Amino acid sequence: EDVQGKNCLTNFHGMDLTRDKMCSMVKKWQTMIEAHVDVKTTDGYLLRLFCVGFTKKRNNQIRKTSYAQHQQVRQIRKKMMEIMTREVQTNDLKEVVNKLIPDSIGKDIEKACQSIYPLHDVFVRKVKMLKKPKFELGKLMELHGETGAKVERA
């Protein structure tokens, strides 16, 4: 975002999950539910978050298929949208990333959906910005912590 004399000062731009990890979770005898939301932070940052989850087979289960019905999927999806929405628009950009580094959103989603259908491998797989606020120098200053040099006239 800004250069300060041989020190490139950066900011968060987006988040993504690796290809191999993404391929490994998607198994064959389970159902995957996906959702996306557009949420604006308190400091004006607009985000698009993607979440993915997979149904879990119980320990004592004998049925080979662990499939969720359509209404249960929508009920699971509706909870996912509400949790991601509420956890971003209340906070700012700094707080969200601190939540995102250990993925506190995914664990909170997993616990809330146990009543509808048990889930595992719940993650926020991708984060995008659609709009950025006007660049202000002071806002960058707390993230990273001139007049010039005098030359004699001839």
Binding site: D92, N98, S104, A112, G138, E142, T147, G148, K150
Partner: protein, 1066 residues
């Protein structure tokens, strides 16, 4: 309904029109007055021909109103009765504004008393001046006129005017201005071009009569004034044909005057008068832009559109329909005048006195009004037309030029000799133009708009010399700071290689210097010395001081910059560098570090889900920001059982430390108890665990309490509260006797929801707002200081004052968002004094989140249930249908007291800043009376930690037990220990039902006690009411009164030592 909204709009227009117009009965007697004046003026004696130099014929008691600086003339004077008497102006046009009614009368000069060459060397102006003088002598003795005076017509010092007013009753309704005018076709229009001459240099300045030299400079302003008298009747004739026929056009014209009046853009010399917009609407009728079937509101809608979109200083417009080959070109007028308008006669600029800065201010005001009109919302009519806009309340900083005589020297340094010759001897109006032009270029990046005050039109009585240019008034400049660009402390020029660098070196002089930067470029640059953001807010003061000294020879002593004088009220005893935002930033960064430490702590059974701050410090609303502290060991006692200190009995009270509240939420789980008191047991255990883990992993001093944990980090003390999500729900469980378990709101349930959910949201919401508006913190802290200084701090919550302060930055519809603390404070007092809280709720649109459809719905609900709401209601998107922040807020009685105080404190504070001399005492509005209170108690300064926060600095301080050397601390200081607050709680608990106690939390040395009249009347023996009451037998029956003499000695016993003396009156 749209019809009802139009109905509300039309009635608002009509009720505004009626109050600003004049009654029929008042018209009739004014018609009677002018008939008497016309009868009086026509019978005047004549005088024989005399040389214009000889003025001995005039009697003592009358003086010529011109100053006649070059006394040598080449003309003769004869007086004759006026040939024709004509009433001109807007009286017969039907557009007169109520506060000032003026009727203009034109006196047609006889031809036989004027000469062909009277248009040169001020001969016409001199002869006109003495004609008025002879009339004034013969009209003063008449008993019809209550008062007769001299003044300037059309704002010209070379064109005096005569004032006549009636006697006894009816004295103020109308005044008559007498304007002599030459014969219709006496003068040649071709002789009065802006490029032609009428004042010869030999007569004006030279001693030789025919000294050869350069060609005579053109005199455009002189030519305009002479032609101005000749076209008096033509304006009235044109306006009668176009404007008199169609109603609604007058309504728009009358509405335009009110708009100009409110924004102070009409009065003064060179002001945008209402005469101008009357010609402007005539020009608009000539086009297709306005048609005669328009109504009054749409005309103002139409007219301000033209002003906001047309820049007339570069593209002039003409009212002349004819296009002759031999007609003057608009290019010549642009070289002569800054603002170029035209009439049917092209020679008449009609705008020769308005400056470019004045026109730019009009365009800026027009643009702001268009946004309000384009938006559809309630009270837009009120904000547009009945909200006054004083220059002090419309600009962040103001600047005074105290000696106007020094401006004459500025004319000497610059080259205005042809301009000073053209306008007579008015050096003030000559140098007003270029000086503002010089400053706007130097402050282009740091300013949005520059404005200057206009000299008022003087009025002096007969037998007194006319006022001079030096004592005309005081010159004041208004600055509108641009929020971006104030962060930089440099003005960057071009590189030294290209030759425009030399031009940069000329404008800045020695302060222009070479600099190199990390980008690799050598550049001319000027560097100021500004460390704090408040000092950066005063960078234009350094700019204006340097440029006037270099380019005008105007010393710094002649400039009085009024910028941030109130900043001392929210500062230390002697610390003027910063207003405290720097300390606010340091505390915020420490909180972020603590949040990062908590976000990552290991060993908790449940991990942290959310961290939120709920303190005024974290939202930049703390009046006195805290600093890291190190307690003194020998000043204290130490338990040695924990690392906590104890205040000493012989030493004074220690320094005050207030912890910051931080709300923490853990992971949701189903192992929490479903019992109200059992959750209290788990929460307290979590306090113990959190303190134990914190001191082990990071070595921080942590004290565990059943409701909170106090943590000392980097010299700051934070109070950590752990909350549980479903606890408010559990408190709402109420099993009914019939057998149903329901959910009902409870005062305990409402309180917990406020401290853990509502409070963090506002703190986070206002914290982000400070980022867009850096001036929000200063306004809010000054707002709190004023209220707490008026002893009305009790009852007013901290968050409530923040919301009204935030309302200024979010809804400044008449104004622009504030950029200085002082301008927001003035708007704060205006809002409190003038808002109708009874019938209107205050909206705080934090980050939008509310549309107009919702807002009109909520206002509809506001009026339907006003009784259940508090007397003051503030609406936020998060806190809607109610204002939890004022449910326990101030009562109606102390509400009206603040409104009276706010209405009282505003004027002299406005006068103090507008005074060219320095303000005598900024603290006058910060001192309470101490007269109405029955009992006054004085407290010892020894036991008040918050004594440096007093409005009046004591200049002597006690030792509070702090270490100057920064560093870590191994022992906890005492948290939140101040006897004045402990003393008040005891007083309000025992004697709350009997008296009211008033105190100032910042340096209060006196407590105001006011008795309750209803409690002091005799009452029957009620066992619950026997608190402090004794039994009488004065009437033979047992009744109750508070025991006053025992109460007074309770005041001394309670608070022993801290209380010094108690005095009772009446």
């Amino acid at each position: 309904e749209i019809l009802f909204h139009s109905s509300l709009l039309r009635l608002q227009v009509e009720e505004l029109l009626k109050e600003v117009r004049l009654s029929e009965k008042k018209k009739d007697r004014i018609d009677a007055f002018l008939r008497e004046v016309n009868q009086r003026v026509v019978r005047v004696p004549s005088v024989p021909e005399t040389e214009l130099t000889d003025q001995a014929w005039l009697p003592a008691g009358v003086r010529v109103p011109l100053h006649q600086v070059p006394y040598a003339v080449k003309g003769c004077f004869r007086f004759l009765p006026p040939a024709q008497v004509t009433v001109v102006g807007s009286y017969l046009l039907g557009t007169c504004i109520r506060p000032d009614i003026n009727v203009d009368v034109a006196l047609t000069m006889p031809r036989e008393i004027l000469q062909d060459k009277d248009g040169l060397n001020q001969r016409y102006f001199r002869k006109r001046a003495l004609y008025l003088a002879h009339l004034a002598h013969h009209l003063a003795q008449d008993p019809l006129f209550g008062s007769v005076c001299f003044s300037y017509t059309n704002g010209c010092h070379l064109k005096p005017s005569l004032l006549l007013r009636p006697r006894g009753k009816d004295e103020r309704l109308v005044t008559v201005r007498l304007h002599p005018c030459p014969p219709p076709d006496f003068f040649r229009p071709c002789r009065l071009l802006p490029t032609k001459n009428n004042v010869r240099s030999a007569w004006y300045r030279g001693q030789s009569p025919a000294g050869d030299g350069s060609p005579e400079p053109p005199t455009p302003r002189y030519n305009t004034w002479v032609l101005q008298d000749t076209v008096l009747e033509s304006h009235l004739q044109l306006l009668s044909t176009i404007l008199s026929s169609a109603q609604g056009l007058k309504d728009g014209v009358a509405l335009l005057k009110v708009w100009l009046r409110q924004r102070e853009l009409d009065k003064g010399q060179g002001g945008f008068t209402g005469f101008l917009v009357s010609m402007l609407v005539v020009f608009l009728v000539s086009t297709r832009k306005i048609h005669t079937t328009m109504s009054g509101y749409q005309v103002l809608r139409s007219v301000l559109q033209f002003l906001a979109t047309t820049d007339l200083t570069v593209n002039g417009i003409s009212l002349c329909l004819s296009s002759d080959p031999s007609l003057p070109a608009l290019a010549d007028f642009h070289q002569a005048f800054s603002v170029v308008f035209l009439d049917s006669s092209g020679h008449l600029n009609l705008c020769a006195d308005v400056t470019a800065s004045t026109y730019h201010q009009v365009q800026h005001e027009a643009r702001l009004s268009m946004m309000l009109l384009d938006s559809r919302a309630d009270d837009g009519f009120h904000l547009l037309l009945m909200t006054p806009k004083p220059m002090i309340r419309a600009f962040d900083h103001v600047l005074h030029l105290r000696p106007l005589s020094r401006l004459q020297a500025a004319c000497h340094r610059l080259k205005l000799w042809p301009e000073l010759q053209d306008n007579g001897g008015d050096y003030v109006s000559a140098a007003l133009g270029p000086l503002t032009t010089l400053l706007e270029q130097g402050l282009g990046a740091r300013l949005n708009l520059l404005a200057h005050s206009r000299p008022p039109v003087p009025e002096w009585d007969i037998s007194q010399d006319p006022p001079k240019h030096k004592d005309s008034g005081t010159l004041t400049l208004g600055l509108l700071l641009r929020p971006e660009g104030l962060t930089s402390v440099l003005e960057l020029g071009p590189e030294a290689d290209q030759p425009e660098a030399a031009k940069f070196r000329q404008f800045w002089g020695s302060r222009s210097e070479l600099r190199r930067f990390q980008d690799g470029a050598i550049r001319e640059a000027v560097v100021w010395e500004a460390a704090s953001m408040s000092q950066k807010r005063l960078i234009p003061h350094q700019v204006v001081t340097h440029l006037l000294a270099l380019h005008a020879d105007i010393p710094e002593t002649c400039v009085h910059y009024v910028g941030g004088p109130l900043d001392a009220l929210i500062q230390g005893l002697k610390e003027t560098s910063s207003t405290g935002e720097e300390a606010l930033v340091a505390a915020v960064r420490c909180y972020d570090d603590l949040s990062r430490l908590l976000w990552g702590l290991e060993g908790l059974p449940l991990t942290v889900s959310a961290v939120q701050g709920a303190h005024p410090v974290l939202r930049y609303t703390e009046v006195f920001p805290p600093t890291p502290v190190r307690p003194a060991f020998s000043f204290y006692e130490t338990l040695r059982e924990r690392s906590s200190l104890l205040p000493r009995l012989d030493k004074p009270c220690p320094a005050y430390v207030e912890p910051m509240t931080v709300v923490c939420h853990l992971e949701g789980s189903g192992q929490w108890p479903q019992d109200a008191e059992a959750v209290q047991r788990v929460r307290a255990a979590f306090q113990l665990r959190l303190a134990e883990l914190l001191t082990q992993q990071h070595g921080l001093q942590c004290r565990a309490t059943a409701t909170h944990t106090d943590v000392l980090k980097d010299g700051f003390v934070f109070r950590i509260r752990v909350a549980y999500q479903r606890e408010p729900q559990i408190l709402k469980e109420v099993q009914s006797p019939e057998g149903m378990i329901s959910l009902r709101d409870t005062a305990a349930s409402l309180r917990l929801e406020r401290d853990t959910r509502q409070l963090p949201l506002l703190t986070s919401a206002l914290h982000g707002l400070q980022q867009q508006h850096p001036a929000f913190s200063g306004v809010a802290r000054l707002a709190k200081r004023w209220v707490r200084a008026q002893l009305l701090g009790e009852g007013f919550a901290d968050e409530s004052l923040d919301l009204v302060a935030a309302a200024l930055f979010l809804h400044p519809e008449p104004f622009t968002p504030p950029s200085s603390p002082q301008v927001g404070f003035l708007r704060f007092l205006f809002l409190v004094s003038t808002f109708d809280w009874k019938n209107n709720p205050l909206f705080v649109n934090l980050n939008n989140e509310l549309t107009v459809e919702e807002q009109v719905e909520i206002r509809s609900g506001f009026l339907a249930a006003r009784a259940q709401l508090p007397v003051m209601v503030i609406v936020t998107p998060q806190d809607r249908k109610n204002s939890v922040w004022t449910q326990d807020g101030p009562s109606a009685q102390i509400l009206q007291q603040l409104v009276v105080l706010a209405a009282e404190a505003l004027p002299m504070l406005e006068k103090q800043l507008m005074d060219p001399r320095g303000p005598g005492d900024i603290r006058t509005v910060f001192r309470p009376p101490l007269d109405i209170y029955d009992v006054l108690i004085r407290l010892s300064p020894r036991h008040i930690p918050r004594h440096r926060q007093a409005v009046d600095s004591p200049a002597a301080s006690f030792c509070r037990g702090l270490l100057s050397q920064p560093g870590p601390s191994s022992l906890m200081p005492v948290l939140g220990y101040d006897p004045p607050q402990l003393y008040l709680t005891q007083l309000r608990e025992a004697f709350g039902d009997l008296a009211l106690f008033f105190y100032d939390q910042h340096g209060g040395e006196v407590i105001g006690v006011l008795w309750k009249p209803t409690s002091f009347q005799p009452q029957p023996f009620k066992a619950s009411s026997t608190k402090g009451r004794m039994v009488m037998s004065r009437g033979g029956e047992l009744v109750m009164v508070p025991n006053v003499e025992a109460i007074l000695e309770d005041f001394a016993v309670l608070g022993e030592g801290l209380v010094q003396t108690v005095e009772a009156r009446s």
